[PDB]
Design a protein around this motif. Structure first.
Motif, PDB file in Angstrom:
ATOM      1  N   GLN A 223       0.827  -1.201   0.000  1.00 15.98           N
ATOM      2  CA  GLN A 223       0.000   0.000   0.000  1.00 15.98           C
ATOM      3  C   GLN A 223       0.864   1.255   0.000  1.00 15.98           C
ATOM      4  N   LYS A 224       1.822   1.336   0.930  1.00 15.31           N
ATOM      5  CA  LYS A 224       2.689   2.507   1.011  1.00 15.31           C
ATOM      6  C   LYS A 224       3.436   2.755  -0.293  1.00 15.31           C
ATOM      7  N   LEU A 225       3.821   1.691  -1.001  1.00 13.05           N
ATOM      8  CA  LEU A 225       4.475   1.867  -2.294  1.00 13.05           C
ATOM      9  C   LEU A 225       3.532   2.513  -3.298  1.00 13.05           C
ATOM     10  N   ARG A 226       2.297   2.010  -3.379  1.00 13.54           N
ATOM     11  CA  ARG A 226       1.315   2.598  -4.284  1.00 13.54           C
ATOM     12  C   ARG A 226       0.998   4.034  -3.890  1.00 13.54           C
ATOM     13  N   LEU A 227       0.906   4.305  -2.586  1.00 10.68           N
ATOM     14  CA  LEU A 227       0.709   5.678  -2.133  1.00 10.68           C
ATOM     15  C   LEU A 227       1.892   6.557  -2.518  1.00 10.68           C
ATOM     16  N   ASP A 228       3.115   6.032  -2.389  1.00 11.26           N
ATOM     17  CA  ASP A 228       4.295   6.803  -2.772  1.00 11.26           C
ATOM     18  C   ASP A 228       4.267   7.159  -4.252  1.00 11.26           C
ATOM     19  N   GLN A 229       3.775   6.246  -5.091  1.00 10.19           N
ATOM     20  CA  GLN A 229       3.761   6.498  -6.527  1.00 10.19           C
ATOM     21  C   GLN A 229       2.704   7.530  -6.897  1.00 10.19           C
ATOM     22  N   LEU A 230       1.519   7.434  -6.289  1.00  2.52           N
ATOM     23  CA  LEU A 230       0.463   8.405  -6.562  1.00  2.52           C
ATOM     24  C   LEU A 230       0.913   9.815  -6.210  1.00  2.52           C
ATOM     25  N   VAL A 231       1.618   9.966  -5.095  1.00  2.58           N
ATOM     26  CA  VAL A 231       2.037  11.292  -4.669  1.00  2.58           C
ATOM     27  C   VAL A 231       3.167  11.825  -5.546  1.00  2.58           C
ATOM     28  N   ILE A 232       3.959  10.940  -6.152  1.00  2.00           N
ATOM     29  CA  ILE A 232       5.056  11.390  -7.004  1.00  2.00           C
ATOM     30  C   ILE A 232       4.535  11.841  -8.364  1.00  2.00           C
ATOM     31  N   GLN A 233       3.655  11.044  -8.973  1.00  2.71           N
ATOM     32  CA  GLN A 233       3.155  11.367 -10.305  1.00  2.71           C
ATOM     33  C   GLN A 233       2.151  12.511 -10.289  1.00  2.71           C
TER      34      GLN A 233
END
Lengths: 316, 292, 100, 317, 324
Positions: A223-233
């Motif tokens: 989950q944290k990885l997917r959250l990290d990607q959403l916030v980056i893009q």
């Protein structure tokens, strides 16, 4: 050309010795495992239970008085009392056969002490950087593994010292014994082989204890990885929120051609019935406009930087 | 209580013969910047003026000096039929009052509210007004006058500036944005004068848009600004979840996972990589379908 | 402010009402039922067009077919009655149906 | 003119004593409550829990050993130990004050026994039909309550007892202590007082234990009631899915006048003449698809009341 | 896999000068029944003769120019549907599409056979008089990769079950069946599991004639079949008893709040054991309110929105084999 890395979770059971200790951990504080404590309770009490199950999912010998009574000898039960070690043995046996070099990361420095005794039992040449290792020391360990014609085959590392900007492309396989709570820390360890200079396919094997606490931990990091990607893009969505030379022209030019041609009044100007036609058609155009834009993303809404560089007129 | 979601409708309007003359005059007296000859830096400022003059034209020709026939200026039917938005407003207000609804009218320009004031008196519409003028103009007194039970008022003229002050106008159910603010959040803050806790009826928002003119292109650029603002909010919410540490419930659900079940060959070793990679790709698929 | 549908058994009586609506300056459309499908689609939509110019709509009782919508009208006048009560009953239900 | 009846759900809580028994019933078989065990388990185990919760939502004294210890008295505890009794006590009081009489229905006869002790305690004159009541008895019970200037006030019945067509229009209020699984049963009990001969507005009060099992029971019955209406309202559909004389006559007469008028070819043929360039075909297909949409969107939206052909349509004249 | 929905288009067609003469002759030869005077058997004959005229005059004996009967362009320009079909097929071939052509009358396929030979159209045919080995020879000869065939003539009630002609993407219903379910089978010989392209179905309808009226009556029965389907679903659900899961959701409802409750529950807790008239007025007021809101939720569920378990519809094939 740098090949994308293969990430494979390896779901692992546990030995009977791991089962007894998994029970003892839950038994020694079954009131907390059932969650019957107060909310004033500091996170420490539940965090202690978590760490034990992490130690248990790695190797039972991390507990005091767990390893068979004195003397302490390196045997096969160092391998067959831990579920991960059984799969690790044959994987190392097969990786070594196909001429590939492997980096083995872990969270616990006391587990590298267990892999320290394991590699001696199997005759594997290796290096080790703890993060409790000196700087000039961990330069010699990096060079020894990266020297042409190196004797070494395994590199034991903690996830701490993995993410420093170092380069270990002379290996091509990354084995994560256990995963960090911060997913971007394991990705710092994968990018030791998978970076500029790597010639072969980098494959990452993640050891996960199936149907235990490590399987649930994997979902929290996923989950944290997917959250990290959403916030980056979606990061550039804020600078896009903060007008061009081309937008101002198109704003001014929008109907200018139709206006110059007019000789009387304009669109609707050229009954209460006359208002019901406007409100009905206006609602229709409103539906299509909101539907088109409120489904968009930052790939569309983002203005490129060269878009502000008005150069000439494509259509006079 | 039930607060019905607001119905927002763009009302696309044409221009009168007088507006076209002025709209052309604005474009003509400054064609070099319009054709693109503006240049690098000076150009950007010249274009910002042309935009504002066209918006004045879309609102009312009488905002330009020398447009209305010379002194004296009497309020007659020419105040309405010389502006496209006024014609639609005149008949829309006629329907709004007949169906027993009261309407708030917002605007970016106070000099346009001046025109709307002359309109209401010309038609007999009881009204109040807030210009954001803090000079002897107590805005609290007009709010109370409009909200009083059995009130005489029907129209409330406001500037979009003075709307977003935490004022409450729930006794009206219709909001008409005569023109729109460049910042969509200002108009949304203006809608919530009627569409807030206390409203009992369906709030409908009418946004006047001059079709096939600058106001229509602005309408699209507003849809861009409104939507990505939602993305920043979504990024902010997603930012917290990435920075948030585990709760006691998050830790307990992690500990209890599989706790109950515990209390209770290389062709095959290769099967783990098949069974694991199947679950590995499957795990990523669940989260790649989330998105903002 | 009401809009009206007028039904009749006889198409030649609607011929008389046509001359009447011209004599009084009323806007209207007409479906004989011996018109055409596309022609009566246009007559329907023009009468239901938001902002319609028309006021009266001339119909024969068994003309339109099943399920046409003329709810933009609110008054129905049966100039004469059918032998079957359902034909008149379905003529009223052009206006008295979902959407009215 | 028979006024449409007023049906009101009266949502009631539970006394402190009911909560104790309600918890015990859920506790004594908490495995089935949490949905544990195999999926092969027969329906008997859960249905037994439903019965006990239904009795507990009615009155705790339906469980043996519930009523306060020996010796046993009939006092105010019979009212305040069950939430439905507390609401009923003031409801019945207000009903008699306005000159109204009431039919009280129940699923359980052991509850009407409890209500009998209540009616004697408050001095209410009453009648009772049980379903375990002989034919000549309930005839006299009906007549007693329907006698002009009757002494009685409350009529205690089980929802099924009397049978079809019995008349109790000398009452205007109906109280359903508990509801039935099939909605026609409760609906028939309201129509004991809501039928021809009733002069006053029939009001039906349905006691429902809010936030418990009886509220969830009620939603299901309301669904099954809504289903029944859709079936019955659509019962005309299968008999419509032959051909009337007029239906066959309309097929032949359709456009026949325009055919007699025509001397050359019909529409598509007269305008274009058996030779068709690409533009003419393109209009034919665009006109057809447009007519196809309007035709389908007109009929696929209809209902039974528009498709149903009256039997008087066959009376061709 | 993804199966593109079928596009059904009614193609309204006129009649040639020859058709008008016969259509008038049919109406005139029994104008007494057309006028209104009782036996439908007299009308059922008129209907069937008009359908033949809408299809092709050469179905009437003595219509085609006298012996010898030569196959020329007159086979086309004397029938309204043939004129439309000849140019429709010509465009169908140019866009690389293959067409199945159905008809109620086998003698009409005979006319189409002579047309296909006159135009050089390779064809196959299944008449319901066709042997199994002869049917399978036509199916394969039409489906084989790189096939030479282009048109496939079938009767609507040929009765082939599960016949697969997915190598065609266009279906033309030369005339329509009185039972719309029979035509839907003919469509689902190209529009079935296996179809990769967009299925377009052209239904020839003689405009301003009997075929246009039949088209409207077919939509009525087509909707009535949908209503029977929905009545059946609502009927099955109404007689259905509660599941172990449905009983479970009833038992579990509020069970947590009861375990949560230490003293009294709900109304008995809000004002315990003694209720003034102000207390009863509040219960009855909220009770009548929740009753209206509860009824409104269920009063909005119509037949057209029912929980479908099996997904049948009057607008798709019954699976029923129509061999008449």
């Amino acid at each position: 050309s740098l090949l994308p890395k293969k990430e494979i979770n390896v779901y692992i059971g546990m030995s009977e010795m791991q089962v007894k200790w998994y029970q003892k951990i839950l038994e020694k504080d079954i009131d907390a495992v059932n969650g019957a404590g107060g909310k004033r309770e500091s996170k420490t009490r539940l965090l202690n239970i978590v760490m034990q199950l992490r130690k248990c999912c790695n190797h039972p010998y991390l507990f005091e008085g767990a390893e068979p009574g004195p003397p302490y000898t390196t045997d096969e039960h160092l391998i067959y009392n831990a579920g991960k070690m059984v799969v690790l043995d044959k994987l190392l046996k097969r990786i070594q056969k196909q001429g590939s070099r492997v980096l083995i990361f872990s969270q616990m420095s006391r587990l590298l002490d267990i892999l320290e005794d394991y590699c001696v039992f199997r005759g594997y040449k290796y290096c080790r950087i703890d993060g409790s290792t000196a700087h000039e020391d961990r330069i010699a360990a990096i060079d020894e593994y990266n020297k042409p014609g190196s004797d070494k085959f395994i590199f034991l590392l903690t996830t701490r010292a993995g993410g420093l900007g170092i380069n270990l492309t002379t290996a091509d396989i990354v084995i994560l014994y256990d995963s960090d709570w911060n997913p971007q820390a394991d990705l710092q360890a994968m990018d030791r082989a998978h970076r500029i200079g790597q010639t072969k396919q980098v494959v990452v094997y993640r050891f996960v204890t199936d149907n235990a606490i490590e399987e649930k931990v994997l979902e929290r990091a996923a989950q944290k990885l997917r959250l990290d990607q959403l916030v980056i893009q979606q990061g550039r969505a804020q600078v896009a929120a903060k007008a061009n030379k081309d937008e101002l022209l198109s704003m001014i030019q929008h109907g200018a051609e139709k206006v110059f041609q007019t000789k009387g009044a304009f669109g609707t100007m050229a009954d209460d019935d006359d208002i019901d036609a406007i409100l009905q058609a206006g609602e229709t155009r409103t539906k299509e406009l909101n539907a088109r834009y409120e489904k968009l993303g930052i790939d569309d809404l983002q203005k490129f930087t060269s878009e502000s560089a008005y150069e000439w007129n494509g259509e006079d």
